[PDB]
Amino acid sequence: HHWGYGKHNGPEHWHKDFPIAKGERQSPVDIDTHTAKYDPSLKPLSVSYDQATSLRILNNGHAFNVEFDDSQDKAVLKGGPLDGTYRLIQFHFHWGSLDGQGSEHTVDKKKYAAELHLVHWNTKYGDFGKAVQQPDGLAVLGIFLKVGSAKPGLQKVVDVLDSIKTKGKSADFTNFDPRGLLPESLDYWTYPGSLTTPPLLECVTWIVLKEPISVSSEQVLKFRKLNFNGEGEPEELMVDNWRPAQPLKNRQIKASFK
């Protein structure tokens, strides 16, 4: 499998190997703020990260992942639209070559500079590989990034990127607190969707926060110095690793707020 984000292997090609790319609940989507409806049945969202155990940071050739110990209920997402308990396994970002693009979700067609995904899996399915085979297997918290002030809680990530420049590189990344990446407000939109990269499985409850976080131009510039390629291969900067918005089809986006 040779998928990526270039002209010859990018999102417009993925359907040939992954036909679900044209499916009924694909992600990301545009969030029309005038059509999304407040849902008073949504319970309060519960982000419990105080015992999170980060382990490692990895350049996988498509993004960089910060991985967590998910062998116990240490860092969990509950509530909101969710039934049951979802364990944090990793976070990563999608970002652009310029500040005017980079997010996967859009808000009234606005693109943000980047988007953070905190990925969690439903503990009722026992392991992550089983969970992705279920319609309610994953819960992903999506957080928009805009360029302005620096985000102090992001700097420890930015400063290790030099050590994982190329595909397949990893570095120890213990004692990182993901609570430092959240906005003040947990107001959100939610809808059923999919992974936004191959294999594009339709297994995700998306929870997209309304409030973006601010990062500095210097912080996002360091994202853009990473490489898609491996060491000793021609340099391809890791930029524009985002899938565009997909048809909403027979789905409603619900708001947690008035």
Supply the residues annotated as catalytic.
62
Cα 6 from Cα 245, distance rounded (Å):
17
Angle at 40 between CA 35 and CA 43, to 5 degrees: 120
Task: In angstroms, give the least distance from the CB of 104 to Zn ion.
Answer: 7
Residue 248 in tokens: 């909403």
Task: In angstroms, give the least distance from the CB of 149 to ligand IZP.
Answer: 25
- Closest-CB residue for Zn ion? 117
Is 10 or 39 the residue whose CB approaches Zn ion more closely? 10
Cα 214 from Cα 64, distance rounded (Å):
19
Task: In angstroms, give the least distance from the CB of 47 to ligand IZP.
Answer: 16
Cα 50 from Cα 10, distance rounded (Å):
38
Residue 255 in tokens: 């708001």
1 annotated among ligand-binding-site residues = no
- Closest-CB residue for ligand IZP? 117
117 annotated among ligand-binding-site residues = yes
Q: Which residues of this chain interact with Zn ion, rule CB under 5 A?
A: 117
Q: 226 touches which of ligand IZP, Zn ion, none (CB within 5 to 8 A by kind)?
A: none
Residue 236: count of CB within 10 angstroms of its CB: 16
* 19 Cβ neighbours under 8 A, 6+ residues apart: none
Cα 138 from Cα 118, distance rounded (Å):
10
- Determine if 117 is a binding residue for ligand IZP (CB under 6 A): yes
- Determine if 21 is a binding residue for ligand IZP (CB under 6 A): no
- Determine if 215 is a binding residue for ligand IZP (CB under 6 A): no
- Total binding residues toward ligand IZP, as defined by CB under 6 A: 9
Q: What share of the chain is helix, strand, coil (3-state, %, to 5)?
A: 15, 30, 55
**Residues that constitute the known binding site:** 92, 94, 117, 196-197
- Catalog residues that contact ligand IZP under the rule CB under 6 A: 117, 119, 132, 138, 140, 195-197, 204
**Residues that constitute the known binding site for substrate:** 196-197
